[PDB]
Design a binder for this molecule. Structure first.
Ligand code: PNN
Ligand code: PNN
Ligand code: PNN
Ligand code: PNN
Length: 262
């Protein structure tokens, strides 16, 4: 138990919920874990794996990202800020990837999942890049039920941090695809209250948030601290009551503890 792990435990104790953290510091490859091997519901953070899998497919199909996908009225689900504008029209796979990542559009995520052959296709890509933990079992919006003890649509902080590192800083994707993914993450619109609220302003980052039932509040990020090699940070948080409120502040607090511990 490290000093940082002790502060994370204190934060968790005061939060009432269950906190999972995984940091990889690429300056030396060291890691900091808190419940790093416990499973948590991914919710929207799973959108990174789906977009990355489509990017992988695009490496052998130069026109894939320009394929027009039909958006029908019935395709709309619970949260579709971008897709709703294109009902009875089409969106390209690039448009669907950007909407899923940067706006957390659920209809867009469902189109990425369908392009991959269903939730199992997203899981297959994860296995192909060495992630033996990740599992996607359902489409949107049910993949966000986040029921405690339910293994569906979960991963561990350790696994997600390693995967995010390989996707954004490593060679799991071709260079062009890696750059596209990083560009999309850096352009996220939903993350200012989460991990990034706990980092010094000078630091830059890309992230993908997630939210679900049980007050599930998640964020995964790739960070470029001022004058330091990048970090990869995963912060997952879930609560005992189905109707619990979101706690993005708890993710900010975890990130702050990690940053001050550097
Ligand atoms: C924008 C959101 C807050 S909502 C969207 C998706 N989750 C859901 O659609 C399900 C949900 C269930 C209960 C409470 C919030 C969201 C998901 O995850 N999303 C969040 C995000 O990207 O941070
Ligand atoms: C149903 C589809 C697979 S077809 C349309 C678009 N597909 C293409 O651009 C090439 C293609 C044509 C026929 C069958 C598969 C792929 C694309 O992607 N679309 C999918 C959709 O609308 O849901
Ligand atoms: C492409 C890779 C297989 S290589 C990189 C990392 N593996 C290593 O860094 C192995 C290594 C050990 C010591 C010195 C240099 C490289 C790791 O895992 N990475 C994968 C990735 O980037 O997606
Ligand atoms: C110091 C570096 C040359 S290495 C560090 C990071 N690169 C990686 O994390 C590559 C990698 C990906 C997956 C697994 C292992 C290594 C990255 O980018 N970093 C460079 C930097 O900050 O200048």
């Amino acid at each position: 138990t490290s000093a940082v792990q002790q502060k994370l435990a204190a934060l968790e104790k005061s939060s009432g919920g269950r906190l999972g953290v995984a940091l990889i510091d690429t300056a030396d490859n060291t890691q900091v874990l808190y419940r790093g091997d416990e499973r948590f519901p991914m919710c929207g953070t799973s959108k990174v794996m789906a977009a990355a899998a489509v990017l992988k497919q695009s490496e052998t199909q130069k026109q894939l990202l320009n394929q027009p996908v039909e958006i029908k009225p019935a395709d709309l689900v619970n949260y579709n800020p971008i897709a709703e504008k294109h009902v009875n029209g089409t969106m390209t796979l690039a448009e669907l990837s950007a909407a899923a990542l940067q706006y957390s559009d659920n209809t867009a995520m469902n189109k990425l999942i369908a392009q991959l052959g269903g939730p199992g296709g997203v899981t297959a890509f994860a296995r192909a890049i060495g992630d033996e933990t990740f599992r996607l079992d359902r489409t949107e919006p049910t993949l966000n039920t986040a029921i405690p003890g339910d293994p569906r649509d979960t991963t561990t902080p350790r696994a997600m941090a390693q995967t995010l590192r390989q996707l954004t800083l490593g060679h799991a994707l071709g260079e062009t695809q890696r750059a596209q993914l990083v560009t999309w993450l850096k352009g996220n619109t939903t993350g200012a209250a989460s991990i990034r609220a706990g980092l010094p302003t000078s630091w830059t980052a890309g992230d993908k948030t997630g939210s679900g039932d049980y007050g599930t509040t998640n964020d995964i990020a790739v960070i470029w601290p001022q004058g330091r090699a990048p970090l990869v940070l995963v912060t997952y948080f879930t609560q005992p009551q189905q109707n619990a409120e979101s706690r993005r502040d708890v993710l900010a607090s975890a990130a702050r503890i990690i940053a001050e511990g550097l």
